[PDB]
Amino acid sequence: TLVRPKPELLKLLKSVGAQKDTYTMKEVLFYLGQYIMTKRLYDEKQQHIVYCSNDLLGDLFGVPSFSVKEHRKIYTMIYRNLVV
C-alpha cells in the first residue's frame, strides 16, 4: 500500500536515510521516529510528546507540538504531505 511525500517531506525522510518515493504508512512512520530520535524532538520529561516549532517537521504539521499517543490526527498531518 505504498506512497509519496511531497517534495519537502521526502527530503525529510531522506535526511534519515530513505532512498525511495514509495512507503506504507507503517513504513513511513518508522522513518519519522528516526527524525525525532536523532533530533531529540521529544520532551525528556513528557516522553510521548513531541516538540517541532524550530524544526522543519514543525512546519509540515503546522503544529509546534503534538503527542504521538493520538493517531486520529497524527495521520491527518501526514496526508497533508503526501501527494495522496
Ligand X SMILES: Cc1c(Cl)ccc2c(/C=C3\NC(=O)N(Cc4ccc(F)c(F)c4)C3=O)c[nH]c12
Which residue ranges make up the site for ligand X (CB under 6 A)?
29, 32-33, 36-37, 42, 47-48, 50, 68, 74
By rule CB under 8 A, what count of residues binds a copy of itself?
12
Task: Extract long-range pairs of 2-8: CB within 8 Å, 24+ residues apart.
Answer: 2/27, 3/28, 3/82, 3/83, 3/84, 4/82, 4/83, 4/84, 5/81, 5/82, 5/83, 6/81, 6/82, 6/83, 8/56, 8/59, 8/60, 8/81
33 binds a copy of itself (CB under 8 A): yes
Query: Of 4 and 42, which CB lies nearer to ligand X in the complex structure?
Result: 42
Contacts with a copy of itself, residue ranges (CB under 8 A): 30, 33-34, 37-38, 42, 44-45, 47-48, 68-69
